[PDB]
Design an enzyme around this catalytic site. Structure first.
Site, PDB file in Angstrom:
ATOM      1  N   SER A  48       0.851  -1.203   0.000  1.00 44.29           N
ATOM      2  CA  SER A  48       0.000   0.000   0.000  1.00 44.29           C
ATOM      3  C   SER A  48       0.879   1.244   0.000  1.00 44.29           C
ATOM      4  O   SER A  48       1.637   1.407  -0.955  1.00 44.29           O
ATOM      5  CB  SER A  48      -0.987  -0.092   1.136  1.00 44.29           C
ATOM      6  N   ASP A  52     -10.069  -4.039  -4.635  1.00 45.13           N
ATOM      7  CA  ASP A  52      -9.388  -3.115  -3.694  1.00 45.13           C
ATOM      8  C   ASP A  52     -10.167  -1.804  -3.601  1.00 45.13           C
ATOM      9  O   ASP A  52     -10.193  -1.071  -4.576  1.00 45.13           O
ATOM     10  CB  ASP A  52      -7.948  -2.877  -4.135  1.00 45.13           C
ATOM     11  N   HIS A  61      -7.734  -5.339  -0.710  1.00 47.40           N
ATOM     12  CA  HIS A  61      -6.523  -4.585  -0.326  1.00 47.40           C
ATOM     13  C   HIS A  61      -5.629  -5.385   0.640  1.00 47.40           C
ATOM     14  O   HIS A  61      -4.447  -5.116   0.646  1.00 47.40           O
ATOM     15  CB  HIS A  61      -6.941  -3.262   0.305  1.00 47.40           C
TER      16      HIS A  61
END
Ligand SMILES: [Ca+2]
Ligand SMILES: [Ca+2]
Ligand code: NA
EC number: 3.1.1.74
Length: 259
Positions: free
Chosen positions: A131, A176, A208
């Site tokens: 991320s 996501d 995610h």
């Protein structure tokens, strides 16, 4: 055994979905013992006198090293020294994560324990991250052209434009809702130079947090990219070239890694 960096037997797909040929142990870096980052965990091979390339990996916003523990161990067990950082603050952004990956790589090369340096070829280093950690992986790739590879996992960044010659494999998650692939992963991929070896893979139905638990696809693509570029191990082209993988719902490359 002509390639001096080649480690382990000829790969098969199934072997790349479990821990690999090397036993692994951890070293815990305390927050207080280091400047430039918040410590972390080094996963490194045991039962061997060989040396391996190094990987610095960053977790994402509010996460710590344990969010990528499974992947640090998985990568190390395939023949890598893998440092998963804790950040100075859980709330550090993507560029702060790049700086901390920078401090972690310098730490790996210069002042890691004797046990780690004996297993480390400090000339062969790569970066990965989840991320915002993936955003950090892209920023540091722009700054440090000696990095062998970059693997941003479900990456997030406000900057959509990176210039690096460091080979990049991006992992997108189809479902996501935190770093949607249309706003993050795909623009990162498309805006990377046309002359940089690059691959985008999109995990069907994945969220995610797909990178935060064992994931056969993340294992296969991350080991294979790191093998190919950190070790110059062309035996791993077979998993990155001519790809027909039902776990994927998108695949894009400029095909500079297959020859
Ligand atoms: Ca610190
Ligand atoms: Ca930019
Ligand atoms: Na650096």
């Amino acid at each position: 055994m002509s390639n001096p960096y080649q480690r382990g037997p000829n790969p098969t797909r199934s072997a790349l979905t479990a821990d690999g040929p090397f036993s692994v142990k951890t070293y815990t870096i305390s927050r207080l013992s280091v400047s430039g980052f918040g410590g972390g965990v080094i996963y490194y091979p045991t039962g061997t006198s060989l040396t391996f390339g190094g990987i610095a990996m960053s977790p994402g916003y509010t996460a710590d090293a344990s969010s990528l523990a499974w992947l640090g161990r998985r990568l190390a067990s395939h023949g890598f020294v893998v440092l998963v950082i804790n950040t100075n603050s859980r709330f550090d952004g993507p560029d702060s994560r790049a700086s901390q990956l920078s401090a972690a790589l310098n730490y790996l090369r210069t002042s890691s324990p004797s046990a780690v340096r004996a297993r480390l070829d400090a000339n062969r280093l790569a970066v990965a991250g989840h991320s915002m950690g993936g955003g950090g992986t892209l920023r540091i790739a722009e700054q440090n052209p000696s990095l062998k590879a970059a693997v941003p996992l479900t990456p997030w960044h406000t900057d959509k434009t990176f210039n690096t010659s460091v080979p990049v494999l991006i992992v997108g998650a189809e479902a996501d809702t935190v770093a949607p692939v249309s706003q993050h992963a795909i623009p990162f991929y498309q805006n990377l130079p046309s002359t940089t070896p690059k691959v985008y893979v999109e995990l069907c139905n994945a969220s995610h947090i797909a990178p935060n638990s064992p994931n056969a696809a993340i294992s296969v693509y991350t080991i294979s990219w790191m093998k190919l570029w950190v070790d110059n191990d062309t035996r791993y082209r077979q998993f990155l070239c001519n790809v027909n993988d039902p776990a994927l719902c998108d695949f894009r490359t400029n095909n500079r890694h297959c020859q």
